[PDB]
Amino acid sequence: RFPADFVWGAATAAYQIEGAVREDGRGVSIWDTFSHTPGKIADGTTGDVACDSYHRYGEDIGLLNALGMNAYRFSIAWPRIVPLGAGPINQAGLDHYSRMVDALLGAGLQPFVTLYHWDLPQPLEDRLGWGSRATATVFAEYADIVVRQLGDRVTHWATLNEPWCSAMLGYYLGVHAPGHTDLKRGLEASHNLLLGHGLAVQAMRAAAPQPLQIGIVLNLTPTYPASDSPEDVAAARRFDGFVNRWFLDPLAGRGYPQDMLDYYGAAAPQPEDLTQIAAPLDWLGVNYYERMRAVDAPDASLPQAQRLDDPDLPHTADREVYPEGLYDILLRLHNDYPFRPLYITENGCALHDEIAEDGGIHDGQRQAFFEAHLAQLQRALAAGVPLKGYFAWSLLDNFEWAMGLSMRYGICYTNFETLERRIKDSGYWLRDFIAGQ
């Protein structure tokens, strides 16, 4: 059993589900630009329509209610709120989210709002985006405006989702928007994301009409050397630094990890910033999908660490399944780092889901995925980890970034042609598991 007041939710992000990309004054985001660039998305799709949740968030609410959830993690689209990124507000964007928040509260669903889930306004990108310190400042101003208007009703806020992705996939590996490919630009982006976050936490506390519970959401990948050789151990530490400690340590008031500063060398970004980054948080969100079993790869791009596949583990449509990594990473946070309480702000999986002849979606491996990770959460809780909720990624099938509409993570199936949603078997399992609490 979980605590009686445990938060039980599902998660989405605005660009992945909303559609209506030009409606009601919305500006252009980097993902509008990126998905409309030939060859950036695997299947030729965009977020232009997606799940049409701009218009259909009522149906999404109906799903959450049918699942017996008590919370919904979703993001606010910065391009709807300040269409030019730096500039005037768009009250019609704020009013949309206001109505949505009221609909959620009316349904008994607590909103866990993400300010930034990757949809940087394009005019900011045109001035270097996360490569520019001014972007941090104006992110903080956006955070101020949203909290002034919604913070009477929404207490739980996350500044960023997965700054590692925004910086390293967006500016270093080039697979996410805006599609840059330079290490130094990636690392500069990571700094300005973190500064942005810190400036926003301060801004939000000053703007808020009541005390808030502010967090950040990080993807964390527990890393394990494939052997105990100095080479493989070092590769594990480098990957662990590249993904996890690079963000955890400055958030914790510890500066950037020195081993990584040494390794990155001249690519590393340029005390006062560090203080701001460490603005005290009320909680930390963990997004957990996979481990990294690392071998040294001296000829690879930094961090010169490659995955050693294990064919004996299960795999989904896109990842290796390793539930025990969730326990490991939570125990580490609890014992080694100062953030508390913690929320699992995402966990879930992608499969080749189809509507069967009976009308159901028989996604047994996703059911087994939830059951296995929830069992690891019970262990973590038994160890004293201060965990206060769990959000399944995703409420519904959606626009999965560079993989487009083709990679389905929902607990609900989305027919992208009709926009009809249907609960999958794993969604019914969650329903009935949550009810039994």
Ligand SMILES: OC[C@H]1CNC[C@@H](O)[C@@H]1O
């Ligand atoms: O790839 C699965 C998910 C990982 N976390 C961020 C989400 O936007 C994404 O869909």
Ligand code: NA
């Ligand atoms: Na498989």
